[PDB]
Every structure is written in structure tokens, then in C-alpha cells.
Amino acid sequence: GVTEEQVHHIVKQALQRYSEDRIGLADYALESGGASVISTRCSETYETKTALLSLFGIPLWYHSQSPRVILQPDVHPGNCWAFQGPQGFAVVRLSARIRPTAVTLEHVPKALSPNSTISSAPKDFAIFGFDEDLQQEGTLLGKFTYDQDGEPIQTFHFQAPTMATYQVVELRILTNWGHPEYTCIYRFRVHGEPAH
Amino acid sequence: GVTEEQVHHIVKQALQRYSEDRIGLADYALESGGASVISTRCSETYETKTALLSLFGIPLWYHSQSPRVILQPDVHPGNCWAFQGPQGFAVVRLSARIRPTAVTLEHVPKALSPNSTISSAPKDFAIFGFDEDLQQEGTLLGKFTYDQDGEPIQTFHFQAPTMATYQVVELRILTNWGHPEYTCIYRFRVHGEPAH
Amino acid sequence: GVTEEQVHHIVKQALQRYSEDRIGLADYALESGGASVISTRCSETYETKTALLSLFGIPLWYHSQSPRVILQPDVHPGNCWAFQGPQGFAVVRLSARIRPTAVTLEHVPKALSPNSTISSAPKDFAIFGFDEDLQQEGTLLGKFTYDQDGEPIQTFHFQAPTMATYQVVELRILTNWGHPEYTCIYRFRVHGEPAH
Amino acid sequence: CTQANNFARSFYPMLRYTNGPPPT
Amino acid sequence: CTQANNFARSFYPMLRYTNGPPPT
Amino acid sequence: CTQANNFARSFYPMLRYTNGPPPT
Ligand SMILES: [K+]
Ligand SMILES: [K+]
Ligand SMILES: [K+]
Numbered sequence A, B, C: 001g002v003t004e005e006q007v008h009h010i011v012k013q014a015l016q017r018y019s020e021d022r023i024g025l026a027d028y029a030l031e032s033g034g035a036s037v038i039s040t041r042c043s044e045t046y047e048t049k050t051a052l053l054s055l056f057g058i059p060l061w062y063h064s065q066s067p068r069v070i071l072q073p074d075v076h077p078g079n080c081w082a083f084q085g086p087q088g089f090a091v092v093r094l095s096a097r098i099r100p101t102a103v104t105l106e107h108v109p110k111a112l113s114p115n116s117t118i119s120s121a122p123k124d125f126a127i128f129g130f131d132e133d134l135q136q137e138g139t140l141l142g143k144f145t146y147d148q149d150g151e152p153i154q155t156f157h158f159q160a161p162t163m164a165t166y167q168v169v170e171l172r173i174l175t176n177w178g179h180p181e182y183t184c185i186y187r188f189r190v191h192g193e194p195a196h
Numbered sequence D, E, F: 001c002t003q004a005n006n007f008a009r010s011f012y013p014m015l016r017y018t019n020g021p022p023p024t
Helices: A003-019 A067-071 B004-019 B069-070 C004-019 C067-071
Strands: A034-039 A051-056 A058-063 A081-085 A088-106 A124-130 A141-144 A151-155 A166-173 A182-185 A189-192 B036-041 B050-055 B058-063 B081-084 B088-106 B124-130 B139-145 B154-157 B166-172 B182-185 B188-193 C036-039 C051-057 C058-063 C081-084 C088-106 C124-130 C138-143 C152-158 C167-174 C180-187 C187-193 D014-017 E014-018 F014-017
Touching: A003 B004, A003 B139, A003 C004, A034 A067, A034 D014, A067 A088, A067 A182, A067 A189, A081 A088, A088 A124, A088 A141, A088 A182, A088 D014, A166 A182, A166 B050, B004 B081, B004 C004, B036 B069, B036 C167, B036 E014, B069 B081, B069 B088, B069 B182, B069 B188, B081 B088, B088 B124, B088 B182, B088 E014, B139 C081, B166 B182, C036 C180, C036 F014, C067 C081, C067 C088, C067 C187, C088 C124, C088 C138, C088 C180, C167 C180
Parallel strands: none
Antiparallel strands: A034 A088, A051 A058, A051 E014, A081 A182, A088 A151, A088 A166, A088 A189, A124 A141, A124 A166, B036 B088, B050 B058, B050 F014, B081 B182, B088 B154, B088 B166, B088 B188, B124 B139, B124 B166, C036 C088, C051 C058, C051 D014, C081 C180, C088 C152, C088 C167, C088 C187, C124 C138, C124 C167
16 A cells, blocks of 8 residues: 555645645635624624623623624634524625635534534525625525534535625525524635636 | 555544544533633732833733633643642633543643743642532542653543532642742643533 | 554654644744744834724724734734835844744745735845844844745754854845735744753 | 614624725 | 632633523 | 834834743
8 A cells, every 4th residue: 555655745735734724725704814794684692691701809791702703713612603593694795806616614523512412503504695785685605504413614615606706795594403592603714716 | 554545534533633622522621611710729820020011112011821821722832821839729610510530731842842841831730629619628539640751732531430520620730840930831621521 | 555553653743743833843932932023123014004993883993913923823814914015124032042043934825815826925034133232233144035835834944053142033024925015924933942 | 684783783893894905 | 728719819800601601 | 224113113012021931
């Protein structure tokens, strides 16, 4: 079979990829790149009023995750946007106008979740692009299911994308994996071709 | 021996694990999961009064690591809680009531420490669980030694744990690796089974 | 060729290294270790006035990267210090007095940059050490080129370093890779031997 | 979902790129 | 270590989960 | 580059280790 050198090379390549945002596709929805969440429509952040900050003993305020964590890379357990119930929206102005060719959703891995279950994960969802103004009914680009038994990061390629470019897209979460009280969104990424 | 495919698979599995908090066990002491440090008893943070922040030239304040870094994942050099001398405590309300089956301690790796030594690492330590209120003398669950010549992350399994659950545990550091002035704690994790 | 065990071991070693700041050399310019940027001379941060923060709809301020990101580990796209034009400086008081033996520069990888190009990367640069006070003309230690077709992280070893120690060094960026408007510096590291 | 926007009406700081991208 | 608690009596913000877990 | 220092004269907080290293 293979040689000690071959192995090294395979491993170098694997770690190279690993270090390129795991999956090696640019992310036009990454916040630090110039992307942002511009609206959650009527999505009500599920506030637990649980994380009390307090100085010298005096209660200052409760922390909760901004819906903008969804465009940030820290994906430790609890670093997700939670909203009430199994349905919710996020409108993201991508850092650039692109032809969207794919998206990535990821969730905390099972082995780091209590009981190896992740009922708060999104399930069925869809992606709408908007040609300018977000208040239009937007154009649907794809509908997919986050697979609770799949890998934590999963990438969904659109079927025969038009060559229509967009800079505003909406992550519309339609179902969850059964958690009765909220859905928690860890990270959402948007890949595609920049205009020319 | 092995095939090019076998190798890929091994590497995929290794990186899968790598990405599941390195060791693939949930962490009931991770802060973002809902855990917190609730007391350092009489542990005096070793304040160096060294990290001066300052705007337009005017001294605002000295930074020092909160004892709460111990429940945060950023483990670059200097991201540790320091306390005076070789003895110190941290009481952690875990994010959940569990039967504690193991803990993890880790420290900055040698190769990133000056002179490849880490005298400020903890050495002998122990874990006490509290059945409700932390002010009791607590029940000892285990006593271990962080091995300065071992790997940076090390996991200690308790010997014949009772099936007693707890939500408050205490990291009690008994010795260090010889640094005459402080001990620096990078990250402390607590693993176990959630109640049912 | 090799065995399944050999492979595991190779992979364990590779990930061990990977986790030791990728390259397993201490970094005396890492901020959290006690290093800092003490001067950018006349380097004008390129402020885009683009990242508006705003509460309840009311504009608070524009964000821009401090030149001090260059000594921080978060290297996602956009986490870099930008300055006007292709020439700029950063004076870093290292966390320790050392004989500087090498430096590391890294930049966002191509595969995460739009069009797989990184024209805003630094190109030709040099390193000056200062024996005490930064306002002297400093002693040159090395001159190198960041290779836009090389790997994202690259380490440059000085040719026959004197055994002269320093605690203040200056990253002097002389050219960029063609971007007409700014250069973006992701991370700068300084390696060497601590004094004795 | 009608014209709603709860992010806009909250105690949460909001971030948006009024010009082009930030430098990268 | 008697009834001591220096974390409680400092310039350091303290964080604690008065309800159950945060969402995850 | 003469005696200049724009970091020193800005709205950016500056950090420096007046004593020795921080603990690590
Ligand atoms: K996130
Ligand atoms: K830590
Ligand atoms: K950086």
C-alpha cells in the first residue's frame, strides 16, 4: 500500500484543508468579512433571563446570544442564537454581491451535547435571495434538511442555480429536531462566485 | 499494510475527534454551556499590575485574567488564571447535575513556553463534590497529579465513582511544578453522566 | 509500506504539532504572553468608516481593527490591521528579551479570499531590532518576502544572527501584493532564545 | 413575515457595513 | 478554607446561571 | 520614519506591560 511519505503528505493536505475554515470555501456571510445580520423579521430571541452578570454582588444584566453569533466562528456549546419555537428567520447582507452556489449550516457535535442528542438543531430550512430590498417576497434559492445524524458541519449545494447574483439572502428555518422550547443556530455560511 | 483510502479514513476520524473539543467528552464545567465559577474561597488572584490599558496616553486600568478563564476555551499562552503561591481553589457550579466520572486539566504546551518549562503548571490536585451548599466540608471525589512531562491536555478518570450526582464541584490545587510565585490554571473540564 | 499503527502515530504527532501554534515555536510577540505594539510610527490606519455599530437604530461608532490584531491569534478573514498604501511599520515590545532567530508572518489563505487572490498581503518586509530605545535608527536583522503563492503561515529564519538580544523589534512592511488601497496584516510572530 | 424586524428594536448592538467591505 | 470568597468581593464581573442552562 | 507614533495619538486603547510578563 502506501509509504510513510505518502502518509505525511495526505496529513499535510488534510490539515491544510482543516485550517481553511474546515471546508475551504470562502464565506460571504462571515461577519468579520463584512457580512451582517440585517433583520430577524419577527423572530423572537428566546431569552432565558439566566446568565446574570454582577459586580461586587450587584446584578447588572442578563446575557443572551445576539442573533449575530450565527455569522461568527466560535462554535462551542451555547454559542448559538436561540429563538422561540421551531420557526425563525435571519436576513443576512452578505459581504459581497455573488451568485450563491451553496450554503453551510453547522451545529454543536453530538458528543459534546448532553445525552448525545441535539433536538434544538435546525431541521428543514430554505434560502431566499433578494434582488435589492428585503421587504419584497424574496426569490427561493433552495430548501434542505439539516441532518441530526450527519456530520456537525454540512454544506448544501443549490440545484441548477440561475446566474442571478444577490447580496441579501435569508435563512429561513422551518422545523427543528424536536426541542419543545427553542431552536439554536450555531453558524450559517454562504458560498458562491463573486461578480465580474 | 494500509491503503490510501484507509489512511484518509483514519485522518477523517482523527480530525473529527480533534474538532470535538479534542477529546470528545461533553464538558459540564464549560462556561458557555451554563457553568460558572462561584467562589475561589480565599484564593488571591496574583495581580502583577503589569497590563496597563491606556487611551490617548492616559492610564485607564490594569488587566488581569479573571479566575473564570478556567472555564473558557482560549488556551493561548497567558490566558490562565493565576493565584499567589502553589495552593488555590475554584468552586464551579456545573451547567448540570451529573454523576462525575472524570475531569480534564490542561496547560500551555512546553514548546510554546520559554525554556520548554512550565513550572507554573498545577501538580497535585483534588476534586470535591457538594450535594447542595458549597460551605460544607465537601465530599472528595479524586486526587491526581498533572504531569508536567505528559501531554498538555490530560484526563483523569475517577476510581469507582458512586452514582452520587452533583452540580457543584471544587478544583482544589495542592501543589505546583515549582514556580516560586504563582500557579497558572488554563482550563478545567468536568465530564460525567447527566441525571435520569 | 506502513501499518495502521504507524499511521495513527504519524497523525497523533501531526495534530500534536498542529495544536502547538501550528508550528511549535514560542512566540515572543504574542500579545497575551506579554508582548505589545508600542508604535506604528507614521502608519495611518486605513479607516473605511464602514463598520457602523448602532443601538435601537442610533449610530454609535465605526469599528476598525486596532494595529494590535497583528499580535492576536484570531485569523479569520478581516481580522487584520489595515494601513494606507503598501508601506507601514509596527514596533513591538516582545514579551521578553531574546536573541531573535526567526519570525513568522501569515495571511488569510487564498481559498477563503474572493477570487483566490490576496493582493492586500504584505510582500517585501524587514526586521529591525533596537537595543533599548525605539527612536534610534534601529539595527537591521533580516529582509524577506511573503510569498503570495506559498502557504498562509510562513517562517523566516535569520541568516547568521549575532548573539545580540533585543526586546523591541520593528516589522517594517516595504511592499504589498498589488492592492492599490491598503495592506492588511493578519499575524506577526517573533521567535528566538530567551537570555541566560 | 410581514414588515417585522425585532433585531432593529432591541437592547442588542447591531452592526452593518455602510460602505464596502472592511479591509481583508 | 473557612467561609471565604474573594471572587465575590472584587472588581471582576461574575457570571451565574440563575435559571437553568442557557439555550444550546 | 522620524519620531512619529499614530497609535499613541488615537481613539484606540493601547496595551503595555509596565512590569514584567503577565503570569503564564
Ligand atoms: K457561531
Ligand atoms: K482558559
Ligand atoms: K490577528
